[PDB]
């Protein structure tokens, strides 16, 4: 399985409790039970940070909901202790998800006394965990399919939220990993993989080849635009560009292949041959260029078996003219996929620890 997922951002442990504890007892004089119970809920919050961003990595829904709860909580804490004018000192330290950093001294780290920056990197990890769970699904299983489609759309929409938001939410120029350009490209990639899940669902359910071709054609568009975003950049890991380039051509070929079954059904045998020749050319390009990244052997065979039978019978029986590609109609496009908006709360059965305030 050749799906792209994103590694989690690392962060050093922080004592969330103390800098809040003291900032509570300033505007809460009664140091006996009621108003100093926010100081115990602030203890649960520090515990939540360590649970969300501290634990050994769990590629499971349990870890994701923790991460999402913590995002939700941070959004609820921003008005309580007005963070626009700085009066609290709390410094979060996050390492860049992709930048190795020169081994000639230090990785790429950014420390910022900012709720804006923390919730950005948190949301990044929600997106990146969602992407990893999506990619580990069993796509030869209908619930596996449903999980992937759901997690890719979540993540896509979460990267997009950061894109729109990072600059405003931070004081400094962000790290590259969360900059709008990197995170806009990740968004598109997750959206591409979500579309491809719909094509795999449609294929599995043996739906109408016309529909299946339209969903593959739209996947090809999303994969095309993503690689063209990586073409002059070296931010993402080195497998990403060639996997996207190949999926672009793998998807155009699936589009042509399913369109050619529609054509055969309609007895347009010349057009079948023309579409199948297109698909074989595309797939031969991926086999020769992207052999390290994708295994395209059985599709090549399916296509070749079909092209050979098609030519034989056209030559012997039908004698249709094989059209030029530029004379064929365009395959349509069907998108079944969107970037899930981030509207807190995004966690299940969310309770604001500081809802009294």
């Amino acid at each position: 399985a050749t799906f792209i997922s994103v590694q989690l951002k690392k962060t050093s442990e922080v004592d969330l409790a103390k800098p809040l504890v003291k900032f509570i007892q300033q505007t809460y004089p009664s140091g006996g039970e009621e108003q100093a119970q926010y100081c115990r809920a602030a203890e649960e919050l520090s515990k939540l940070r360590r649970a969300a961003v501290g634990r050994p990595l769990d590629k499971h829904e349990g870890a994701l909901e923790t991460l999402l709860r913590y995002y939700d909580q941070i959004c609820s804490i921003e008005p309580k202790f007005p963070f626009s004018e700085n009066q609290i000192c709390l410094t979060f330290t996050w390492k860049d998800a992709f930048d190795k950093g020169s081994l000639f001294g230090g990785s790429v780290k950014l420390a910022l006394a900012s709720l804006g920056y923390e919730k950005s990197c948190v949301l990044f990890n929600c997106a990146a965990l969602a992407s990893q769970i999506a990619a580990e699904q069993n796509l030869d299983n209908d619930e596996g399919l449903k999980i992937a489609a759901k997690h890719y759309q979540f993540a896509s929409g979460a990267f997009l939220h950061i894109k729109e938001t990072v600059l405003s939410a931070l004081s400094r120029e962000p790290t590259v990993d969360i900059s709008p350009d990197t995170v806009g490209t990740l968004s598109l990639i997750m959206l591409a993989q979500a579309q491809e899940v719909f094509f795999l669902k449609a294929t599995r359910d043996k739906m109408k080849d016309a529909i299946i071709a339209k969903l593959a054609n739209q996947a090809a568009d999303y994969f095309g635009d993503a690689f063209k975003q990586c073409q002059y950049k070296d931010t993402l890991p080195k497998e990403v560009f060639p996997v996207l380039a190949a999926k672009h051509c793998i998807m155009q070929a699936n589009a042509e292949y399913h369109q050619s079954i529609l054509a055969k059904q309609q007895k347009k045998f010349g057009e079948e041959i023309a579409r199948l020749q297109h698909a074989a050319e595309l797939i031969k390009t991926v086999a020769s260029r992207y052999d390290e990244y994708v295994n395209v052997k059985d599709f090549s065979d399916k296509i070749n078996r079909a092209l050979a039978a098609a030519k034989k019978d056209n030559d012997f029986i039908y004698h249709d003219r094989v059209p030029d590609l530029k004379d064929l109609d365009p395959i349509g496009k069907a998108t079944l996929v969107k970037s899930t908006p981030v509207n807190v709360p995004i966690s299940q059965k969310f309770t604001d620890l500081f809802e009294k305030m």
């Binding site: 449903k146 489609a149 759901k150 759309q153 719909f198 669902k201 449609a202 739906m207 109408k208 016309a210 529909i211 069907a334 079944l336």
Partner: peptide, 13 residues
């Protein structure tokens, strides 16, 4: 066609 997209889309919910 139009209604087979509809059911794919609603499966995703």
């Amino acid at each position: 066609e139009d209604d087979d997209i509809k059911q794919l889309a609603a499966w995703a919910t």
